[PDB]
Design a protein around this ligand. Structure first.
Ligand SMILES: [Ca+2]
Ligand SMILES: [Cl-]
Ligand SMILES: [Cl-]
Length: 772
């Protein structure tokens, strides 16, 4: 490994061997079908709302999120980087696909598959990832850095459907070596969302941009149709000329053949035929290839950038709506703009790298923080782009343009709901902290639904009863499903009735006030916009106080985010959120000079606080609730209200002494008595030190709950406990001794390490650990 010298991989990058087999991998622990794509994953490529592509540590383009809101795991074998090398003086060179595996479908038999084991490494620190190739049969050593310009406080490049592949090659040997690097790509028009003749009309064209000192050669892979089908658009791959490198190309090879049309050229001397052919295909799949060839002298280094773009301008959801994706604002909507996107990337990638560096460096250079923490903090952000993210720039065939661009991130793929608010309470820290204009947009979207009334009925999954879809004054669980109508038809979720949840309205208010606080307490307009919805939300919750203790009553069913775990009476969880929400609304009242509201919420808070304290404080911790069989369980999340109050600078809603004791209890029990504190905080433990069996969710660790708990610990000066607590989640996710959930962090696991709901929004809450 002489190539690690020649590139700058941060020490805190997640790392694994190319072709490594992992033995310990967890699987779903539920009886219903649940996604399990295996541990062969990697950092995603693609911007917010662009659709993302998961290129795994083995080199394959395998996890396809190009259809917005869907997860399709399948390796498109034609999509690869390959290398040719010939030592000066030898008769023959060698050619190798940089993929640790081979096709399962008979095609491309001529290519050299099965990249050997123990011959290179994969590294990731999102949005960056790297491959190193250190192969006894490749005298020139190779590395690539790949990324998308995911950049905080930037809403432009961050939207781009583009990836850069920055290659470094170095000759440590005593003889000259001829090297070729070749990028192949399948014309994947028709791969998603086309019912018949999936390849029909696909054609490929080569663009040579000869602008002086900025020469680019690219393939554009599209379709003859100029219609605006949601499957239509273009892919582009290409390369920028650098001194000392020659470019070659092949416009059209058949992907549904043996591959020799291309490979007989590449394997001979690493130079392609440069054959252009714009003839559309009918049945056969087709692809394009871009290569560079160069001679490396002893001790010489060369750097050459490739790029990939995809212009798929329209997203269609199952309910029929068709929307333009955000990046269309910058490149156009007609689906014929792949080359422009690619070119912007090839000409600006260095600037993008520095912008990413500028953002990561304050954290990476902080020598007080361990490497594992950094690994998790950055790599958890994968989900922001990878979470079925929808970001619209107009409905298709809309006359009126709007000022606003609606956004949504999925709960997960198994539970296909946009912006599940009970979850985003945890999972939206990165958006408020790094892309706050999106965050405020999302919360305006929630404000606008408060008073929506939809009197149509639905069957509640848990119990069979009928219920009203949306009630005036009750915040929605979610903003729809990719299978239906995102943003238009809310409350796609039906497992419980969210119109009687006791956490949604409180969390809504807490999120509003959070978003004001963590954007510098200057955005009075946002408070004005949301003020009425805040008062409605709290006033409707007050009415669910059946027993006149000043606090909404849990109703002996799962009426909150723990949607199989029944709460009854006053709960620590919903009770503390309520206290915190009342305190936040008082503060908003002071800010907006609304004396009537200040007085009302202050009075409500004083009564509720005293009653909460008297009903739940047992002298060690706050009981789970007042009326359950399991009322004295120790709930990891029992003081969620106070956690938020710390972030929102609302002071003590509960006495400092009691908080400290509760947190110590949770660490001693829920953490340290659960598999020795190596796997997070189990949600419910009995006071005798055995896990609560009342419901599966009590027996689960929730990744997003544990990261949030860790931040609460940290704010309260329990530094060791905080990081020890978080460490278990890191360990399970990323470590060789864990369960193999990198780039698919799940909601939850049980004691045995098996999981529920991979690729989940809630653990983005690790960013609460960075709160200033
Ligand atoms: Ca009550
Ligand atoms: Cl256009
Ligand atoms: Cl360390």
């Amino acid at each position: 490994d002489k190539i690690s010298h020649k590139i700058d991989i941060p020490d805190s990058a997640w790392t694994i061997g190319i072709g490594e087999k992992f033995k310990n991998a967890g699987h779903p622990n539920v009886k219903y079908p649940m996604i399990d794509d295996s541990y062969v994953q990697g950092a995603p490529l693609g911007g917010f709302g662009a659709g993302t592509i998961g290129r795994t540590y083995n080199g394959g383009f395998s996890r396809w999120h190009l259809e917005i809101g869907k997860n399709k795991y399948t390796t498109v074998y034609a999509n690869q980087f390959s290398v040719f090398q010939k030592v000066e003086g030898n008769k023959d060179g060698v050619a190798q696909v940089l993929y640790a595996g081979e096709p399962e479908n008979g095609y491309l038999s001529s290519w050299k598959w099965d990249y050997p084991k123990e011959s290179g490494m994969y590294y990731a620190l999102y949005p960056n990832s790297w491959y190193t190739y250190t192969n006894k049969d490749l005298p020139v050593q190779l590395a690539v850095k790949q990324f998308s310009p995911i950049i905080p406080y930037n809403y432009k490049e961050t939207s781009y459907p583009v990836a850069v592949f920055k290659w470094t090659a170095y000759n440590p040997t005593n003889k000259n070596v001829d090297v070729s690097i070749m990028f192949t790509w399948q014309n994947m028009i028709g791969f998603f969302g086309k019912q018949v003749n999936v390849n029909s009309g696909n054609f490929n064209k080569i663009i040579k941009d000869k602008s002086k000192d900025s020469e680019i050669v690219a393939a554009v892979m599209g379709n003859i149709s100029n219609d605006n089908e949601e499957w239509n658009g273009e892919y582009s791959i290409g390369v920028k000329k650098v001194p000392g490198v020659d470019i070659s190309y092949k416009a059209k090879f058949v992907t549904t053949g043996d591959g020799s049309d291309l490979w007989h050229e590449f394997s001979k001397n690493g130079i392609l035929d440069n054959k252009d052919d714009e003839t559309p295909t009918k049945q056969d799949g087709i692809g394009s290839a871009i290569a560079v060839n160069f001679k490396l002298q002893p001790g010489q280094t060369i750097e050459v950038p490739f790029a990939l773009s995809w212009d798929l301008p329209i997203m269609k959801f199952g309910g029929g709506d068709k929307w333009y994706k955000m990046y269309t604002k910058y490149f156009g909507k007609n689906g014929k703009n792949s080359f422009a996107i690619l070119k912007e990337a090839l000409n600006n990638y260095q600037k993008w790298e520095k912008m990413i560096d500028d953002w990561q460096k304050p954290i990476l250079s902080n020598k007080s923080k361990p490497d594992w923490y950094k690994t998790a903090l950055f790599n958890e952000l994968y989900y922001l782009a990878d979470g079925g993210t929808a970001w619209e720039n107009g409905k298709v065939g809309e006359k009126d343009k709007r000022t606003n661009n609606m956004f949504g991130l999925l709960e997960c793929f198994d539970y296909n709901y946009y912006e599940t608010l009970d979850v985003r309470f945890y999972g939206s820290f990165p958006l408020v902290m790094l892309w706050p204009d999106i965050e405020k947009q999302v919360m305006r979207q929630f404000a606008d639904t408060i008073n929506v009334q939809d009197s149509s009925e639905f069957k509640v999954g848990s119990n069979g009863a009928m219920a009203v879809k949306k009630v005036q004054g009750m915040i929605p669980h979610d903003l729809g499903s990719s299978y239906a109508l995102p943003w238009i038809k809310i409350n796609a979720y039906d497992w419980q009735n969210p119109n009687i949840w006791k956490d949604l309205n409180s969390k809504y208010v807490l999120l509003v006030y959070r978003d004001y606080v963590l954007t510098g307490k200057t955005d009075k307009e946002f408070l004005k916009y949301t003020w009425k919805s805040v008062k409605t939300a709290l006033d409707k919750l007050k009415e669910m106080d059946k027993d006149n203790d000043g606090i909404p009553d849990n109703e002996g069913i799962p009426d909150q985010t723990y949607d199989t775990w029944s709460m009854k009476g006053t709960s620590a969880y919903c009770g503390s959120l309520w206290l915190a929400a009342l305190k936040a609304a008082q503060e908003i009242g002071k800010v907006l000079k609304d004396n009537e509201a200040y007085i009302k919420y202050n009075e409500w808070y004083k009564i509720a606080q005293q009653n909460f304290e008297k009903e739940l404080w047992n002298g060690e911790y706050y009981n789970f609730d007042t009326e359950s069989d399991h009322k004295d369980s120790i709930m990891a999340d029992q003081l969620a209200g106070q956690w938020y109050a710390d972030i929102l600078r609302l002071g003590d809603i509960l006495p400092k002494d009691h908080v400290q004791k509760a947190l110590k209890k949770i660490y001693e029990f829920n953490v340290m008595k659960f598999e020795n504190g190596k796997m997070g905080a189990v949600n419910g433990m009995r006071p005798d030190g055995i896990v609560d069996e009342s419901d599966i969710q009590a027996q689960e660790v929730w990744t997003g709950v544990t990261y949030a708990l860790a931040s609460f610990m940290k704010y309260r000066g329990m530094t060791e406990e905080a990081y020890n607590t978080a460490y278990g989640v890191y360990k399970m996710t990323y470590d060789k001794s864990g369960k193999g959930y990198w780039f698919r962090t799940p909601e939850a696991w049980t004691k045995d390490g098996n999981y529920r709901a991979s690729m989940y929004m809630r653990p983005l809450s690790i960013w609460s650990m960075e709160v200033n």
